[PDB]
Amino acid sequence: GIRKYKPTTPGRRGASVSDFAEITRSTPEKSLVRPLHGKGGRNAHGRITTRHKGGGHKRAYRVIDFRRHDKDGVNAKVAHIEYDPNRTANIALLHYLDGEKRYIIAPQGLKQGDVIESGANADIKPGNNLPLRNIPAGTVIHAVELRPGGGAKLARSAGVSIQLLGKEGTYAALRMPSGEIRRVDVRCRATVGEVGNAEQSNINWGKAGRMRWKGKRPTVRGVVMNPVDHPHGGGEGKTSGGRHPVSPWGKPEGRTRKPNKPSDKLIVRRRRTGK
RNA sequence: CUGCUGUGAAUCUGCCGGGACCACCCGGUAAGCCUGAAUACUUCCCAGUGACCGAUAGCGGAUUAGUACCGUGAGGGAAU
RNA sequence: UCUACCCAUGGCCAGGGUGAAGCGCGGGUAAGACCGCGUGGAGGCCCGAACCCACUUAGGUUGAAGACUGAGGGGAUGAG
RNA sequence: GAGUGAGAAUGCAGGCAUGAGUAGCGAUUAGGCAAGUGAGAACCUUGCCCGCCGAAAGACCAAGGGUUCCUGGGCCAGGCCAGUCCGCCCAGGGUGAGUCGGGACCUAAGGCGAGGCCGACAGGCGUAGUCGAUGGACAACGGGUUGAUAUUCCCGUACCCGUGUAUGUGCGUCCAUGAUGAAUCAGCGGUACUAACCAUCCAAAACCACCGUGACCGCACCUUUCGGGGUGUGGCGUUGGUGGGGCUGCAUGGGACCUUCGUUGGUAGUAGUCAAGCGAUGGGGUGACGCAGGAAGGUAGCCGUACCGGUCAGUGGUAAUACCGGGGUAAGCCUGUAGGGAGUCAGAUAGGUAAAUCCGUCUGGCAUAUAUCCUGAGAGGUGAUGCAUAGCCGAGUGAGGCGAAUUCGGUGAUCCUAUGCUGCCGAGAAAAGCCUCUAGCGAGGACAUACACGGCCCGUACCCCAAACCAACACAGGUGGUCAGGUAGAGAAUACUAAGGCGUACGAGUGAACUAUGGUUAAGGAACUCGGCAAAAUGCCCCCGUAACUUCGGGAGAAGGGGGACCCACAUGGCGUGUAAGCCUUUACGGCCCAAGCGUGAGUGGGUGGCACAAACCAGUGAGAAGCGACUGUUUACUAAAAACACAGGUCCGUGCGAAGUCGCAAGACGAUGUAUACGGACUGACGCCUGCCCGGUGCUGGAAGGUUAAGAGGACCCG
RNA sequence: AAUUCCUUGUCGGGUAAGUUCCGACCUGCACGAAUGGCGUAACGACUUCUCAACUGUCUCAACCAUAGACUCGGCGAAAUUGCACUACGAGUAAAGAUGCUCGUUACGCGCGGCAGGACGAAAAGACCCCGGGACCUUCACUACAACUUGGUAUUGGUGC
RNA sequence: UCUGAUCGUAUUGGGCCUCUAACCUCGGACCGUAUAUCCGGUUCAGGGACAGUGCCUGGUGGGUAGUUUAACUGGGGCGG
Ligand SMILES: [Mg+2]
Ligand SMILES: [Mg+2]
Ligand SMILES: [Mg+2]
Ligand SMILES: [Mg+2]
Ligand SMILES: [Mg+2]
Ligand SMILES: [Mg+2]
Ligand SMILES: [Mg+2]
Ligand SMILES: [Mg+2]
Ligand SMILES: [Mg+2]
Ligand SMILES: [Mg+2]
Ligand SMILES: [Mg+2]
Ligand SMILES: [Mg+2]
Ligand SMILES: [Mg+2]
Ligand SMILES: [Mg+2]
Ligand SMILES: [Mg+2]
Ligand SMILES: [Mg+2]
Ligand SMILES: [Mg+2]
Ligand SMILES: [Mg+2]
Ligand SMILES: [Mg+2]
Ligand SMILES: [Mg+2]
Ligand SMILES: [Mg+2]
Ligand SMILES: [Mg+2]
Ligand SMILES: [Mg+2]
Ligand SMILES: [Mg+2]
Ligand SMILES: [Mg+2]
Ligand SMILES: [Mg+2]
Ligand SMILES: [Mg+2]
Ligand SMILES: [Mg+2]
Ligand SMILES: [Mg+2]
Ligand SMILES: [Mg+2]
Ligand SMILES: [Mg+2]
Ligand SMILES: [Mg+2]
Ligand SMILES: [Mg+2]
Ligand SMILES: [Mg+2]
Ligand SMILES: [Mg+2]
Ligand SMILES: [Mg+2]
Ligand SMILES: [Mg+2]
Ligand SMILES: [Mg+2]
Ligand SMILES: [Mg+2]
Ligand SMILES: [Mg+2]
Ligand SMILES: [Mg+2]
Ligand SMILES: [Mg+2]
Ligand SMILES: [Mg+2]
Ligand SMILES: [Mg+2]
Ligand SMILES: [Mg+2]
Ligand SMILES: [Mg+2]
Ligand SMILES: [Mg+2]
Ligand SMILES: [Mg+2]
Ligand SMILES: [Mg+2]
Ligand SMILES: [Mg+2]
Ligand SMILES: [Mg+2]
Ligand SMILES: [Mg+2]
Ligand SMILES: [Mg+2]
Ligand SMILES: [Mg+2]
Ligand SMILES: [Mg+2]
Ligand SMILES: [Mg+2]
Ligand SMILES: [Mg+2]
Ligand SMILES: [Mg+2]
Ligand SMILES: [Mg+2]
Ligand SMILES: [Mg+2]
Ligand SMILES: [Mg+2]
Ligand SMILES: [Mg+2]
Ligand SMILES: [Mg+2]
Ligand SMILES: [Mg+2]
Ligand SMILES: [Mg+2]
Ligand SMILES: [Mg+2]
Ligand SMILES: [Mg+2]
Ligand SMILES: [Mg+2]
Ligand SMILES: [Mg+2]
Ligand SMILES: [Mg+2]
Ligand SMILES: [Mg+2]
Ligand SMILES: [Mg+2]
Ligand SMILES: [Mg+2]
Ligand SMILES: [Mg+2]
Ligand SMILES: [Mg+2]
Ligand SMILES: [Mg+2]
Ligand SMILES: [Mg+2]
Ligand SMILES: [Mg+2]
Ligand SMILES: [Mg+2]
Ligand SMILES: [Mg+2]
Ligand SMILES: [Mg+2]
Ligand SMILES: [Mg+2]
Ligand SMILES: [Mg+2]
Ligand SMILES: [Mg+2]
Ligand SMILES: [Mg+2]
Ligand SMILES: [Mg+2]
Ligand SMILES: [Mg+2]
Ligand SMILES: [Mg+2]
Ligand SMILES: [Mg+2]
Ligand SMILES: [Mg+2]
Ligand SMILES: [Mg+2]
Ligand SMILES: [Mg+2]
Ligand SMILES: [Mg+2]
Ligand SMILES: [Mg+2]
Ligand SMILES: [Mg+2]
Ligand SMILES: [Mg+2]
Ligand SMILES: [Mg+2]
Ligand SMILES: [Mg+2]
Ligand SMILES: [Mg+2]
Ligand SMILES: [Mg+2]
Ligand SMILES: [Mg+2]
Ligand SMILES: [Mg+2]
Ligand SMILES: [Mg+2]
Ligand SMILES: [Mg+2]
Ligand SMILES: [Mg+2]
Ligand SMILES: [Mg+2]
Ligand SMILES: [Mg+2]
Ligand SMILES: [Mg+2]
Ligand SMILES: [Mg+2]
Ligand SMILES: [Mg+2]
Ligand SMILES: [Mg+2]
Ligand SMILES: [Mg+2]
Ligand SMILES: [Mg+2]
Ligand SMILES: [Mg+2]
Ligand SMILES: [Mg+2]
Ligand SMILES: [Mg+2]
Ligand SMILES: [Mg+2]
Ligand SMILES: [Mg+2]
Ligand SMILES: [Mg+2]
Ligand SMILES: [Mg+2]
Ligand SMILES: [Mg+2]
Ligand SMILES: [Mg+2]
Ligand SMILES: [Mg+2]
Ligand SMILES: [Mg+2]
Ligand SMILES: [Mg+2]
Ligand SMILES: [Mg+2]
Ligand SMILES: [Mg+2]
Ligand SMILES: [Mg+2]
Ligand SMILES: [Mg+2]
Ligand SMILES: [Mg+2]
Ligand SMILES: [Mg+2]
Ligand SMILES: [Mg+2]
Ligand SMILES: [Mg+2]
Ligand SMILES: [Mg+2]
Ligand SMILES: [Mg+2]
Ligand SMILES: [Mg+2]
Ligand SMILES: [Mg+2]
Ligand SMILES: [Mg+2]
Ligand SMILES: [Mg+2]
Ligand SMILES: [Mg+2]
Ligand SMILES: [Mg+2]
Ligand SMILES: [Mg+2]
Ligand SMILES: [Mg+2]
Ligand SMILES: [Mg+2]
Ligand SMILES: [Mg+2]
Ligand SMILES: [Mg+2]
Ligand SMILES: [Mg+2]
C-alpha cells in the first residue's frame, strides 16, 4: 500500500513510499536472473538518442515468462511474491509440479499458495492463462498477445487491465487500457485478472534525489536555452517561446501515428482526449 | 552522343546518319571482340651542359636534417 | 590524457550531536482512537576535520603562479 | 642580360646598446661555534648546541620518469652568490622470485570481429568468436648480509603444482561376485470394427381438420346508362400456414462379438544389464555480491608492573626508597572455543536441448536435540636448544665477541570474526574456479610413506605529495593508495614532543620615509563609508530557562542567565575490569560470583591562591522586519553563484508496440529486454487558497458539399 | 511594486534630521491569474532596512616587531628608446610648447624621496562611423533534406 | 443508316468485393550449428496485389543552406 512519511526534514515532507505488503521474499531465484546494465540513453553510436536517462541504481533482470504456452494441464502453485526493479508490478514465482520454476507478472488478488493452471481446460480464476477463444466475453484480462505466439504485449503494467468486449469470427475485440478498441486473433493467449500494485501511481517521490536513483536525470526547459539549441529559446526576459510549441528538433505538435500502417486495418477507433 | 524509369520495332524496296521536321538524293551498315607506331611522365641509375646559386643564397637540409626542438595528436621545424 | 555527460569496476568519508518509523511495557477503552516511558537508529538532518568547492577580503598584478597565496567562508551519508 | 642601388614596411636574420651595474635572487622554520679538508669555505665533511615538521616536511608503493642509484674521479657549462659540493659532467659497477606485482587462469564496460546483413564506391553495424582489470580464482613467513638488490641471495621453518622410481596397502577387469530385470506362448476382463438391443431427438413421403385463396368459375349486392371494377360464399388447384398420428433414416449416450490392451500360468533371475577408476566442452549446485546501523566477542598498539642491567648528571635536597634503559619473536602445523550457519532417510517423478543415483517438485516417515556437520575470530600448544635484544668488552672506518630478566595487569582501535547479523528500499557484475550427476572412455588403476627431480616469460636500481612525475625554471601550484607513537583533547582539530627527518642553494648590516604581515591603545563608539567592507566581539562542558509564528516536525544552540583551578574529607566509597580464594558442573578453550590489584568519573562539604580558574592554542555574534526563490543541490575553468538552472508536485499534447521520438543513405541501434499507473514532448514549479472572459488573427485536430489545382490518361480542331 | 515617467506623489511610523525602509491611499505613463495570481512555516556565503553587543571603520592618530625599501659584497634582467650640455612665465602655432617669440630664473655631477607634465608605457579603440565577415531570427528571396499526394513499374486471378 | 431508347458479343478505363501464387512479417517450429535473440533455408500460421522500394508529379518545409536588406545626411538613427 502507501506508507506516508512524517515530515522530519524538508526533503521527506510530502513524500511517501510503497508499503511492500505483498512481498514474501527479498531474494530472487539465482537461476532466473540475468545480468543487465544501463545504457544511459545512448545507442550503438554512443550518441544520446534518449535524453534524461542515466544515473540509476544498478539492477538485475528477472526473466519473466510472457510466453506461457508450453505447460498445459500442469498446475503450478505460487511460491513467493517478490519485488522487481525493471517493471511497475510484482512478480509471482511459480513452482510447477514438473519441478520447473518460472516468474510471472503477479496478478491482482493472487496470494501465496494458490493454484494456477494454464491451458484450454483451465478455470477463469485469476492468474490462469488461456487462449482467447475459451474466455467468456466480458471478463477482465491482462498480458495479452498480438499474434498467435508473439508473447504477451498489452496491459503488462501495474493496476491495469483489458476488458474483452466480444467475439466475431477469428477476431475478438478488446478495449485497451487507453480506451481504444482494437481487434485481435482469437488464437492468442491471455491471462485472467487485473495486475497488482494498483497504488503504484500515488507514490509521491518527494525529492530530486529519489527520481535520480530511479534513473531519470534532470530536464532542461526549451524557453530557457539559447535560440541555437532549442526552437523555443531566446528572448530578453522570460518568454513563452513566441512561437507555436515544438520538439527540440523543430517538429510541431500533432498526430504522429504514421498513416498506412498494416495494423490500421484492425483498429476500431483511437483513444479520445478530453471528452 | 550518353545515364536512370517506362513503353517497345523492323532483317535489305531493312535500318541509322547528313543541326527541329517531311519528301527525294548521298553516305554508312548499330546493338560481338581484340589491335603497334606517332603522344604524356621521371621516385630511380649513368654521362653531361649552365651570360644558374656560392653558405641570411642554392633544397627545409654543404655541419648529426626531416635531426635537435615544439605539439596529446595530425603536424610544425631550425642553427652551425 | 584538460573539460562536459555517460558506462564498467574499486576506494574514501576523524569526531561529536539530534532521535523518524517500527517494536516493547504501562496507561485508555467494549475493542479503538490516543497518552507517557523505553528500546530502535531514520534523514538530498545538525556542528566539524580529511576531501570537494570557491563567498568576502587583503596581497599578488614585467607575479613564487599564463589565475595563485593568506586570513576568514560553503558542502561534508550524498543529485557525494 | 639583369635576382642592379633601402632609411622608413609595429619589415626578417644576426650582432650590440639604452633602461643599469639598476629590479630581482622564489615564502609563511633560523641558525651558531670548534676542528677538518683544500689554491681558495657564510653555503662541503665531522663534532657539540640551537631551531622546524611529527595524519608530516616521517615510512612504503601505484602511475610517470629512465640510471637520477653505488664507488672512483671532475670543477670553464649548469646551480639564481661562492663551491673543495651537487639531482650537473666522466669512467666503471649495480636490479637475482614455483609463493610478491602481472602473462601463461577467468570474465565486466568496451574494442576488434570468420561467415553475415546493409551500403554507388569508400565503408556502417554485427553473430560465432577472441581480446579487455580497476574486479573473481590461485601456494611464505620471521631473521641476517652487501657500497649499492632482497617475501628474489643466505639461515631457519613452511606451503603449492607437475614428473620418475621404489615400497606397502587396498582395489580391479580375466575368473567371478552381487543385484535385478524384461521378453514370447498359454488361461482371462472393457476398449471396440460390425449386424443388432435400449432410450430420445427431428420430419421427407405425409393421413386429417381448419384458414389464406396465382388464377378460374360464377350465385348475390354496390357501381358509371351499362361496363371497368369492389364485396359475401362455395367448387377446387396449393405461391400456402397451423394442430394431432405413424413408418423410415440420423445423431447421441449405455452394455456387448470382432480387434487390442491390461491381468497372470510356463519359462527366462537362463541368454541379458550394470558395478574398479578416469570422467565432460554436456546437466545442476556453489562461485555470487547494495546501503545503513550498532551491540557483542577479540587482538594489534599503547600505559603501567613483578623481575633484570645500569647512572651519581661538580647547584639546596637526594645511595637506593630516587632516576635511566630492557620486560622480545612470524607464517605454518596441531587444537576447534566466542560468533554464525544448516533438517535428514526412503518411494515416485522426466521438468533441467540425450541420460542421470545429482538438482528441482510431490509424497511419505523420522527429528526439536548445544544431536550432528560446515564455518570460524582469538586463547592455549608447537614453530623456538633457535633467532633477536637492553647492556658489557677491548680494538678501532669498523671488525668481532659475550649477552640478563624475558612475569602479571589496565586501556584499547577506523583492524579481525564479518562476503556475519538487524533493518531499510533505490532491490544491489560475469565467467573460470571448486563440488557433484550421468554420456562417454577403460585393463589396469587409485591411497600413503620414502627418495629423486622440473617449476617458464615480464617487473625488481633510485625518485614517487617531489629540485627526479605534470607545471618551458632546482617554479609557494597539481598528483591515487597503504602505515598512524606520547601528553593534553570528544577527535585523524589544535598545542608541545618520540621515532625518523630536515634548517631548501645569495648573504652581512642598519631604530629613514613608505608598503606589506602581525601587535597594543586614553575618552568616545559607526560620528567612517555606497554599505559595520575590514577588524573587534561571540565561542567549550554541565545545569537552569526559552517567544511570536508553525506545514505540528520545527522555530531552538532561540533569547537570557549560573557553575568550572588546586588541595583534603566523604571514600579501604560508586561504576568498569577481574585474579587468588569460594561456589557450581553436562570436567571443558566451562558458568557464577569475586577480597586484592589496576582504571575512572560525577557530586557534596571544607579549605587555599590569583587581576584572571572553558586560564594558552582551540572554539556560534545575536534580535526585529521586507523582497525574491519553497527546500539540499547546479552554473559563466580565467571579472557574474544569483532573484538564474534543477527539483518534488501540476496540467496539456503525442505514443497500441522491431510505438511515438532520436542516431544513421540503409541495415541496425536507443526507447525497453519496457507496454498507456508505461514512454516521449511542452509549459508551470514544495505547500495553501485559487486559476476569470475571447475561437476574430495564427497554429493544431477533425470534416468533404462545393470553388481552385500537377503528372497520367485523353487527341476533336489546327499546321508542315 | 525586482513593474509608477510626472515623483523626494499623499498621509502615518521609525530618526534631533530618512530621495532608502515599513504601513496604507489608487490618479495601474505601462499589475493580474500555469510566459501562473495572492500568501506561506523551514531554509539562503541572496538583496534591502533597523537595533543590541563590540570595536582604530571614524573624531585623530600614535607606538612596536618582522619582510621588503636603504648601505656594503656577489650574480644580474625587463618593458621602452628619432635625437639631447631636455627650466619657467606670458604668448604664438594643427587652436593644451623642454625644443618657436619676448622676457624672467638657473654653478657642474650625483643619491634618497613624491607623482603634476613628457597629450608617459601597455594593447594598428572594444565606444562611434564606414567597408568586410560571421552567427542568430523570421508570414525577406531562392533552394535542399525530411514528411506527404497521385500516376506508373515490381503486379496476378475470379467477380460484381 | 441518322434526331434517339436499348440489349447480348467485343475493346477500354473507374469504383467495389474477394481469392493466392508475387511481395511482407522482430509470428511459430525445425535445420545449417558443437556454441548463435546474428544471418540464410525448409515448413506452419498470418497479412496480400495493398504496403515497401524505384522513376514521374503536386504540396508542406527556418529543419538546414547560400545570400540580399540603397544612398544623400552639418556624426549615425528617426523624419524627409
Ligand atoms: Mg563505434
Ligand atoms: Mg523526458
Ligand atoms: Mg517495482
Ligand atoms: Mg507521480
Ligand atoms: Mg517534498
Ligand atoms: Mg525543467
Ligand atoms: Mg540564458
Ligand atoms: Mg553546443
Ligand atoms: Mg532555429
Ligand atoms: Mg531568456
Ligand atoms: Mg519582458
Ligand atoms: Mg508559456
Ligand atoms: Mg523564441
Ligand atoms: Mg495522456
Ligand atoms: Mg579497346
Ligand atoms: Mg640555408
Ligand atoms: Mg662569407
Ligand atoms: Mg612529443
Ligand atoms: Mg533515544
Ligand atoms: Mg518511539
Ligand atoms: Mg547533511
Ligand atoms: Mg547546512
Ligand atoms: Mg581568496
Ligand atoms: Mg608591485
Ligand atoms: Mg582558504
Ligand atoms: Mg571548512
Ligand atoms: Mg564555522
Ligand atoms: Mg558542516
Ligand atoms: Mg633587389
Ligand atoms: Mg640597411
Ligand atoms: Mg628597420
Ligand atoms: Mg633585431
Ligand atoms: Mg648597459
Ligand atoms: Mg633607477
Ligand atoms: Mg639603489
Ligand atoms: Mg633590492
Ligand atoms: Mg631561497
Ligand atoms: Mg617575491
Ligand atoms: Mg672554519
Ligand atoms: Mg602525533
Ligand atoms: Mg611508481
Ligand atoms: Mg667526489
Ligand atoms: Mg664550477
Ligand atoms: Mg656559479
Ligand atoms: Mg646522490
Ligand atoms: Mg652522465
Ligand atoms: Mg564491429
Ligand atoms: Mg569480413
Ligand atoms: Mg586477458
Ligand atoms: Mg588487478
Ligand atoms: Mg635501497
Ligand atoms: Mg626481508
Ligand atoms: Mg546475482
Ligand atoms: Mg543482507
Ligand atoms: Mg570492542
Ligand atoms: Mg648535591
Ligand atoms: Mg623502567
Ligand atoms: Mg532429490
Ligand atoms: Mg599462537
Ligand atoms: Mg557492515
Ligand atoms: Mg623443486
Ligand atoms: Mg623500471
Ligand atoms: Mg628490489
Ligand atoms: Mg626498491
Ligand atoms: Mg617524501
Ligand atoms: Mg608556467
Ligand atoms: Mg622539471
Ligand atoms: Mg628550490
Ligand atoms: Mg614544487
Ligand atoms: Mg589529494
Ligand atoms: Mg596524536
Ligand atoms: Mg596538524
Ligand atoms: Mg613543533
Ligand atoms: Mg630528533
Ligand atoms: Mg636603514
Ligand atoms: Mg622599519
Ligand atoms: Mg598595522
Ligand atoms: Mg579606543
Ligand atoms: Mg577603553
Ligand atoms: Mg548603531
Ligand atoms: Mg552615516
Ligand atoms: Mg559623512
Ligand atoms: Mg546612502
Ligand atoms: Mg565582516
Ligand atoms: Mg577575529
Ligand atoms: Mg533547548
Ligand atoms: Mg545560548
Ligand atoms: Mg530567531
Ligand atoms: Mg576466580
Ligand atoms: Mg568445592
Ligand atoms: Mg553451577
Ligand atoms: Mg582574591
Ligand atoms: Mg561554535
Ligand atoms: Mg506587501
Ligand atoms: Mg534557492
Ligand atoms: Mg512559492
Ligand atoms: Mg563549479
Ligand atoms: Mg568566473
Ligand atoms: Mg552560493
Ligand atoms: Mg565569483
Ligand atoms: Mg544557470
Ligand atoms: Mg505546485
Ligand atoms: Mg515536472
Ligand atoms: Mg511531471
Ligand atoms: Mg521509428
Ligand atoms: Mg502545450
Ligand atoms: Mg519559472
Ligand atoms: Mg481566437
Ligand atoms: Mg482557430
Ligand atoms: Mg475557427
Ligand atoms: Mg472558449
Ligand atoms: Mg486542416
Ligand atoms: Mg496526356
Ligand atoms: Mg521596494
Ligand atoms: Mg516615495
Ligand atoms: Mg514620510
Ligand atoms: Mg542610521
Ligand atoms: Mg510600500
Ligand atoms: Mg507598470
Ligand atoms: Mg487563463
Ligand atoms: Mg498564460
Ligand atoms: Mg513563480
Ligand atoms: Mg508576492
Ligand atoms: Mg517568506
Ligand atoms: Mg544552497
Ligand atoms: Mg545564496
Ligand atoms: Mg630589512
Ligand atoms: Mg648590490
Ligand atoms: Mg630590449
Ligand atoms: Mg595657450
Ligand atoms: Mg606655455
Ligand atoms: Mg619657452
Ligand atoms: Mg633652439
Ligand atoms: Mg633622483
Ligand atoms: Mg609624473
Ligand atoms: Mg611610485
Ligand atoms: Mg598621466
Ligand atoms: Mg585603427
Ligand atoms: Mg559594419
Ligand atoms: Mg504497390
Ligand atoms: Mg510508388
Ligand atoms: Mg523553411
Ligand atoms: Mg538563414
Ligand atoms: Mg560566396
Ligand atoms: Mg549612410
Ligand atoms: Mg543628422
Ligand atoms: Mg556637426
Map out the domains of chain A as residue ranges. 1-114, 118-195, 196-275
Instruction: Label residues A49-65 b or e (16+ Cβ within 10 Å = b).
Output: eeeebbbbeeeeebebb
A46 beta carbon < 7 A from strand C? no
Considering only the top CATH level, what class is A196-275?
few secondary structures
> Method of determination?
cryo-EM
**Distances in whole angstroms, Cα of residue A146 to Cα of each of A74, A130, A168, A178, A179:** 24, 14, 16, 16, 17
Measured CA to C1', the nucleotide nearest A35 is D429
Measured CA to C1', the nucleotide nearest A240 is E35
Measured CA to C1', the nucleotide nearest A274 is D652
Residues within 5 Å of ion ligand 12, judged at the Cβ atom: A 240
Residue A104, amino acid? I
Cited resolution, angstroms: 3.2
- DSSP of A110-147: --TT-EEE-SSS--SSTT-EEEGGGSPTT-EEESB-SS
Cα–ligand 68 centroid distance for A118 (angstroms): 83
> Contact at 8 Å (CB) between A29 and A101?
yes
Backbone angles phi, psi at A214, to 5 degrees: -75, -5
The distance (Å) linking the CA of A220 with the C1' of E84 is 70
Whole-angstrom distance, CA of residue A274 vs CA of residue A213: 33
From the number of C-beta atoms within 10 Å of its C-beta (0-12, 13-18, 19+), residue A15 rates as middle
A241 beta carbon < 7 A from strand E? no
Specify the CATH number of the domain A1-114: 2.40.50.140
Which cell is A275 given?
471528452
Whole-angstrom distance, CA of residue A155 vs CA of residue A143: 5
Q: Which nucleotides of C are covered by protein (CB under 7 A)?
A: 5-9, 20-21, 42-45, 78-80
Domains A1-114 and A196-275 fall in the same CATH topology: no
Cα–ligand 115 centroid distance for A92 (angstroms): 72
Which cell is A59 given?
539492477
| Strand order across the A140-142 sheet | A129-131, A189-192, A140-142, A162-168, A171-175, A181-185, A267-269
> Contact at 8 Å (CB) between A224 and A116?
no
A202 secondary structure, DSSP code: G
Measured CA angle at A231 (ends A227, A235), to 5 deg: 45
Pairing of strands A115-117, A267-269: unpaired
